[PDB]
A paper describes a structure:
Several TCRs have been isolated from TILs of epithelial cancer patients that recognize a neoepitope corresponding to residues 168–176 of p53R175H. This neoepitope includes the arginine-to-histidine mutation at position 175 (HMTEVVRHC). The TCRs are restricted by the common MHC class I allele HLA-A*02:01. The structures reveal how oligoclonal TCRs 12-6, 38-10, and 1a2 discriminate between wild-type and mutated p53, and demonstrate that there are multiple distinct solutions to recognizing the p53R175H neoepitope with sufficient affinity to mediate tumor cell killing.
To understand how the conservative arginine-to-histidine mutation in p53R175H, which replaces one positively charged amino acid by another, renders this peptide immunogenic, we determined the structures of the wild-type p53–HLA-A2 and mutant p53R175H–HLA-A2 complexes to 2.37 and 2.38 Å resolution, respectively. In both p53–HLA-A2 and p53R175H–HLA-A2, the peptide is bound in conventional orientation with the side chains of P2 Met and P9 Cys accommodated in pockets B and F, respectively, in the peptide-binding groove. The p53–HLA-A2 and p53R175H–HLA-A2 complexes exhibit very little structural deviation from each other. In particular, the wild-type and mutant p53 peptides are highly superimposable, except at the P8 mutation site. The root-mean-square difference (r.m.s.d.) for α-carbon atoms in the peptide chains is 0.18 Å, while for all atoms, excluding the P8 Arg and His side chains, it is 0.45 Å. Detailed comparison of the mutant p53R175H–HLA-A2 and wild-type p53–HLA-A2 structures revealed that their conformations differ only at the P8 mutation site, where one positively charged residue (histidine) replaces another (arginine). There are two adjacent water molecules under peptide residues P6–P8 in the wild-type p53–HLA-A2 and unbound mutant p53R175H–HLA-A2 structures. We detected no apparent interaction between any of these TCRs and wild-type p53–HLA-A2, even after injecting high concentrations of TCR (up to 328 μM for 12-6, 232 μM for 38-10, and 153 μM for 1a2).
Numbering used by the authors:
A (entry chain P): 1 to 9
B (entry chain A): 1 to 275
C (entry chain B): 1 to 100
The structure:
Amino acid sequence: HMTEVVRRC
Amino acid sequence: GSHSMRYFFTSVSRPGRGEPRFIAVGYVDDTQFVRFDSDAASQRMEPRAPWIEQEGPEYWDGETRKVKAHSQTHRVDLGTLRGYYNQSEAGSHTVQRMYGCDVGSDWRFLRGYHQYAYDGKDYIALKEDLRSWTAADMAAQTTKHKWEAAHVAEQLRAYLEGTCVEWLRRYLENGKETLQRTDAPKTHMTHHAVSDHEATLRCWALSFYPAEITLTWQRDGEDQTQDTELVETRPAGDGTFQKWAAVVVPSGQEQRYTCHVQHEGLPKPLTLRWE
Amino acid sequence: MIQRTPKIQVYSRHPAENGKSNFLNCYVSGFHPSDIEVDLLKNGERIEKVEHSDLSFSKDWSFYLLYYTEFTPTEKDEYACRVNHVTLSQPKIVKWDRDM
């Protein structure tokens, strides 16, 4: 189960 | 024992040769259960262990939606990083991300991780309190400031302390027959003469699970490291692991030497002597 | 940009017996960047049907990959693995060795 967090650098 | 889940993400830019290659891979302890390959046909998250097939369509649809969003963000980062580092568009560069959680024997949260690397070196990670960031250099300060602004730590902590461990548990139950096994090493020694003066002893550990193992040589009951050789634990390709250690000894002196093998599969550590 | 040269190990899945089907392994680790070139060789000839693992990496961020193929070994037939990587000045070759 991956995280929802995909914030950009 | 203790257990863990880990995800491993790699994006590689290829200038003039299209969009970034992106590979994602999911792990419980030392068993791979999930994968995505941007250059495969399915364009879906795909199972790699039998027990994950117990998951329904909403899972596969949720994981694919996510792995694609991860790929989209790595596609943007490769561009962003290039700016932060003032690099040209000609070279190839690599973004790596790793995250997941550790639970102890009681399957409760011990530790969580979330780290990023640019071209082979730390870029930004989440500190062990899961509430602040360590920027490896001055460029990573720009990122840290953006994620502090958008409250990313808090969202990742919720993941790492709850969601991660809840699903880690569920996997361990669902795949109990594999994930909770122990395969003890099948062990043996070999002898090979280098000349009239010296021989190589090689102590083998084969077919063990999990992968964590120690091999250590002793001479007459004392630790011996000089004139030894240890390979990296390697996969067998059937879900078990292999490893060996060697020592170069004076011909006629073999008997002084013991090989000592610790593994979760050995209640009592093994001693091997050539004799 | 940090670059590391791969380690190479050639070996079999199970203890090798003549006339028993097996797997030939080429495990490459601790390298960066990810692009690498592995081929399995039979008497110096490139085998065709060769699978490999999904790329992953270690605590230090170096890559690792398992290259594998079905085969039935024999007295005569020699096997090697061929590797090329930006850190190599020329492709490396490592022969399989039955005892070690």
